[PDB]
Every structure is written in C-alpha cells, then in structure tokens.
C-alpha cells in the first residue's frame, strides 16, 4: 500500500538485490508541506541495508522498486510508518509522510 511517482529516469537495468547496501539522498516532509528531515542539510548520504529492519517499511518498499540513479517520490500511510504513536516532538500521531528519494550508488 505505497504510492510511487517518478521524477527523473534511471538506468532501468540495475535494481537492489539481497545482501546489498543502498546509499540515498532524501528529503522528508508532512502531508501539509512542513519539512521535518533532510539528509542534504548534513551533506552526508544515508546508508541502510535491506532485510535487517533498519528503517520504516514504507521507505524499504519504496526503495526496492527504484533503479540506480532514479529520482522518485514516495507516500507512506500512517499504519506503515509510525502508527498512532509517532515520533515524540517530531511527528504527531496518525501522520502521512511524503519523501523525495534519489538513489546514488549500490554496494
């Protein structure tokens, strides 16, 4: 239950595979356009590995369908990101998240 929209095309031939690590630059914001996180502010790409439950389900499912070099937008429902608890002081309960993810390199 995740909506994906394309912004820029990718190679279309390389996709994430089991045992690889994804390096991405992302920007997060609420459904009302209020930004709450951005990896580009810290000028440091974020690294995560598939299958080890290091990030929310929405992010992993969104990234699994992206090709190398592709820029796309992801939408996650409250039941898939944080549910009725949220992140204290950052995200309120029952919030829909929108992400701007770009895949840089795979390893």
């Amino acid at each position: 239950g995740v909506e994906i929209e394309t912004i820029s095309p990718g190679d279309g031939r390389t996709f994430p595979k089991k045992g690889q690590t994804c390096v991405v630059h992302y920007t997060g914001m609420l459904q009302n356009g209020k930004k709450f996180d951005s990896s580009r502010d810290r000028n440091k790409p974020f690294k995560f590995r598939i299958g080890k439950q290091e990030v929310i389900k929405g992010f992993e499912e969104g990234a699994a369908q992206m090709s190398l070099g592709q820029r796309a937008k992801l939408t996650c429902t409250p039941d898939v990101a944080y549910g009725a608890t949220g992140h204290p002081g950052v995200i309120p309960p029952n919030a829909t998240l929108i992400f701007d993810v770009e895949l840089l390199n795979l390893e």
């Binding site: 820029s8 930004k35 951005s38 580009r40 502010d41 820029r71 701007d100």
Partner: protein, 49 residues
Amino acid sequence: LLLQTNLINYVTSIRPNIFVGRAEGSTQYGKWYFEVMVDEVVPFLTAQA
C-alpha cells in the same frame, strides 16, 4: 504556534518586451505562439532543488 525558520534560494524572472491583449475595437490579433529551449540545469546546486 512558534515561528519557523529555514534556508531558501533566491528566484528571478525575465521577459521579452511584447504585449498582447483582448478588447472591443482593438487592432491586435488573437492567437500567439513561442518556444523555449533548455541547455543546462544543475539539479542540486545547494541543499534545495
């Protein structure tokens, strides 16, 4: 409630000096056309697109 802050980019606009309109008794034509061609863009020159 509290005031928010951030960093944003500057933006500007450019136009050519041609003007067209619609009115009773006007001497102007009613249909127009033009094109734009893009050469270079840097998707992320700073933290903002």
